[PDB]
Amino acid sequence: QRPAPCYDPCEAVLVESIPEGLDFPNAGNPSTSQAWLGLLAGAHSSLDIASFYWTLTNNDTHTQEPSAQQGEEVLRQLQTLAPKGVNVRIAVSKPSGPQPQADLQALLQSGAQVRMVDMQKLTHGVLHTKFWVVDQTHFYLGSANMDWRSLTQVKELGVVMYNCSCLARDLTKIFEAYWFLGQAGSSIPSTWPRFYDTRYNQETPMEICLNGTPALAYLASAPPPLCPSGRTPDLKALLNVVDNARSFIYVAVMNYLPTLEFSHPHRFWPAIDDGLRRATYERGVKVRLLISCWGHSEPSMRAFLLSLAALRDNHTHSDIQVKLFVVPADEAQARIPYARVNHNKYMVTERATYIGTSNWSGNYFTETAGTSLLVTQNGRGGLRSQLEAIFLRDWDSPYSHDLDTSADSVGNACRLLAAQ
Amino acid sequence: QRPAPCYDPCEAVLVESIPEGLDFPNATGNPSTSQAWLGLLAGAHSSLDIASFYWTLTNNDTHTQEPSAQQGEEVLRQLQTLAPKGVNVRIAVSKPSGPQPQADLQALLQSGAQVRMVDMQKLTHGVLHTKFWVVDQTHFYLGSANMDWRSLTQVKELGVVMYNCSCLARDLTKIFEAYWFLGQAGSSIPSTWPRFYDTRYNQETPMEICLNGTPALAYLASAPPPLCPSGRTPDLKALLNVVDNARSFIYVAVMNYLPTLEFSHPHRFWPAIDDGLRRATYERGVKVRLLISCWGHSEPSMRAFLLSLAALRDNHTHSDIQVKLFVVPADEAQARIPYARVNHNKYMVTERATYIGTSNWSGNYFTETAGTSLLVTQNGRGGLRSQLEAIFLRDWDSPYSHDLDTSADSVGNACRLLAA
Ligand SMILES: *[C@@H]1O[C@H](CO)[C@@H](O[C@@H]2O[C@H](CO)[C@@H](O[C@@H]3O[C@H](CO[C@H]4O[C@H](CO[C@@H]5O[C@H](CO)[C@@H](O)[C@H](O)[C@@H]5O)[C@@H](O)[C@H](O[C@@H]5O[C@H](CO)[C@@H](O)[C@H](O)[C@@H]5O)[C@@H]4O)[C@@H](O)[C@H](O[C@H]4O[C@H](CO)[C@@H](O)[C@H](O)[C@@H]4O)[C@@H]3O)[C@H](O)[C@H]2NC(C)=O)[C@H](O)[C@H]1NC(C)=O
Ligand SMILES: *[C@@H]1O[C@H](CO)[C@@H](O[C@@H]2O[C@H](CO)[C@@H](O[C@@H]3O[C@H](CO[C@H]4O[C@H](CO[C@H]5O[C@H](CO)[C@@H](O)[C@H](O)[C@@H]5O)[C@@H](O)[C@H](O[C@H]5O[C@H](CO)[C@@H](O)[C@H](O)[C@@H]5O)[C@@H]4O)[C@@H](O)[C@H](O[C@H]4O[C@H](CO)[C@@H](O)[C@H](O)[C@@H]4O)[C@@H]3O)[C@H](O)[C@H]2NC(C)=O)[C@H](O)[C@H]1NC(C)=O
Ligand SMILES: *[C@@H]1O[C@H](CO)[C@@H](O[C@@H]2O[C@H](CO)[C@@H](O)[C@H](O)[C@H]2NC(C)=O)[C@H](O)[C@H]1NC(C)=O
Ligand SMILES: *[C@@H]1O[C@H](CO)[C@@H](O[C@@H]2O[C@H](CO)[C@@H](O)[C@H](O)[C@H]2NC(C)=O)[C@H](O)[C@H]1NC(C)=O
Ligand SMILES: [Mn+2]
Ligand SMILES: [Mn+2]
Ligand SMILES: [Mn+2]
Ligand SMILES: [Mn+2]
Within 6 Å (CB) of ligand 4, which residues are found? Answer: B 11, 163-164
Residue type present at position B79: L
Domain ranges of chain A: 9-186+198-409
Report the alpha-carbon distance of residue A362 to residue B320 in Å, rounded: 22
Cβ-based neighbours of A136, under 8 Å, separated by 6 or more: A45, A46, A165, A168, A169, A172
Cα B387 to Cα A419: distance, rounded to the nearest angstrom = 42
Establish whether residue A354 lines the binding site of ligand 3, counting it when its CB lies within 6 angstroms of any ligand atom. Answer: no
Query: Distance between CA B208 and CA A337 in Å, rounded?
Result: 63
Q: Which residues of A touch B301 (CB under 8 A)?
A: 313, 315-316, 318
Q: Count helices and strands (H / E) in chain B.
A: 14, 21
Distance CA A241, CA A360 (A): 14
DSSP state of B71: H
CA B365 to chain A, closest CA, distance in angstroms equals 19
**Resolution of the deposited coordinates, in angstroms?**
1.5
Cβ of A390: how many Cβ atoms within 10 Å?
A: 20
Contacts of A267 in chain B (CB under 8 A): 283
Buried b (16+ CB within 10 A) or exposed e, B227-254: bbbebbbbbbebbbbbbebbeebbbbbb
Contact assignment for A303 to B311 by CB distance below 8 Å? yes
Q: Kindly report the protein residue whose alpha carbon is nearest to atom 56 of ligand 1.
A: B29
Locate the chain B residue with the closest alpha carbon to A313: B304
Mutation test residue for ligand 2: of A13, A33, A134, A386, the one with most atoms within 8 Å of CB: A13
| Contact criterion met (CB < 8 Å) for A300 and B314 | yes
In Å, what is the CA distance from B196 to each residue of B170, B173, B373?
11, 11, 20
* Candidate of A31, A34, A39, A208 to mutate for ligand 2, largest count of ligand atoms within 8 Å of Cβ: A34
DSSP-derived pairing of the beta strands B157-163 and B9-17: antiparallel
Q: How far is CA B252 from the centre of its chain?
A: 12
Asked if omega into A265 is within 30° of 0 (cis), the reply is yes
User: Which residue numbers of A are catalytic?
Assistant: 128, 130, 135, 343
**Residue A400: what residue type?**
S
Contact by Cβ (8 Å): A127, A92: yes
Burial class (CB in 10 A: 0-12, 13-18, 19+), A255: buried
| A107 vs A85: CA distance, rounded Å | 14
User: Which CATH number applies to A9-186+198-409: 3.30.870.10, 3.90.79.10, 1.10.10.10, 3.40.1380.10?
Assistant: 3.30.870.10
Query: φ, ψ for residue A347 (rounded to 5)?
Result: -145, 135
Q: Which atom of ligand 2 is nearest the CA belonging to A211?
A: 1
Mind telling me how many Å the CA of A316 is from chain B's nearest CA? 7
Please give the Cα distance from A359 to A341 (Å, whole number).
Answer: 13
CA distance B123 to A159: 55
Cis peptide before B190 (omega within 30 of 0): no
Length reported for chain B: 420
Alpha-carbon distance of A107 to A109, in angstroms, equals 5
Residue nearest to atom 23 of ligand 1 (CA): B31
* Cβ atoms of A371 and A50 closer than 8 Å: yes
Q: Are B292 and B306 in contact (CB under 8 A)?
A: yes
Q: Are strands A370-376 and A353-356 parallel, antiparallel or unpaired?
A: antiparallel
Residue B122 assigned as binding residue:
no
Q: Is residue A10 in contact with ligand 2, taking CB distance under 6 Å? A: no
Please indicate whether, in this complex, the C-beta atoms of B268 and A277 are within 8 angstroms of each other: no
Give the integer Cα–Cα distance in Å for A123 and A154: 29
Identify the CA nearest to B378 among candidates B194, B214, B167: B214
Residues before each break in chain B (C–N > 2.5 Å)?
A: 27
Alpha-carbon distance of B16 to B14, in angstroms, equals 7
User: Which residue's C-alpha comes closest to atom 71 of ligand 2?
Assistant: A30
CA A348 to ligand 2 center in whole angstroms: 23
Instruction: Indicate the top mutation candidate among B163, B209, B211 to test ligand 4's pocket, ranked by most ligand atoms within 8 A of CB.
Output: B163
Chain B: give the shortest CA distance to residue A256, in Å.
15
Binding positions of A: 128, 130, 145, 343, 365
Round to the nearest angstrom and report the end-to-end CA distance of chain A: 59
CA distance B148 to B302: 26
How far apart are alpha carbons B208 and B174 in whole angstroms?
Answer: 18
Q: What is the largest CA-CA distance in chain A?
A: 66
Cα B350 to Cα B384: distance, rounded to the nearest angstrom = 12
The CA-based dihedral angle spanning residues A241, A246, A248, A250, taken in that order and rounded to the nearest 10 degrees: 0
Q: Closest chain A residue to B283 measured between Cα atoms?
A: A266
What is the rounded radius of gyration, in angstroms, for the C-alpha atoms of chain B?
21
C-alpha distance from A360 to closest chain B C-alpha (Å): 18
Query: Ligand 3 centre from A386 Cα, in Å?
Result: 22
How many residues are there in chain A? 420
Check CB contact under 8 Å for B278 and A268.
Answer: yes
A267–B275 C-beta distance less than 8 A: no
B107 vs B73, B86, B112, B140, B320, CA distance in Å?
12, 17, 9, 23, 51
Determine, for residues B304 and A282 on separate chains, whether the beta-carbon distance falls below 8 Å: no
- B contacts of A259 (beta carbons < 8 Å): 282
Determine the distance from the C-alpha atom of residue B406 to the mean position of all C-alpha atoms in its chain, rounded to a whole number: 27
Going by C-beta distance under 8 Å and a sequence separation of 6 or more, which residues neighbour residue B285? B318, B319, B320
Among the four given CATH numbers 3.30.870.10, 1.10.357.10, 3.30.200.20, 3.30.1360.200, the one describing domain B9-410: 3.30.870.10
- Which chain B residue's Cα is nearest to A284? B267
Contact (CB<8Å) A316/B304: yes
Rounded to 10 degrees, the C-alpha dihedral B400/B406/B408/B410 comes to -60
Q: Any binding-site annotation on B131?
A: yes
Closest residue to atom 2 of ligand 4, CA basis: B164
Residue A32, SS3? helix
C-alpha gyration radius of chain A? 21
- Preceding omega of B266 cis (within 30 degrees of 0): yes
Ligand 3 within 6 A of CB of A163? yes
Of the candidates A369, A362, A417, the one whose C-alpha atom is nearest the C-alpha of residue A117 is A369
Nearest to B269 among A267, A278, A308 (CB): A278
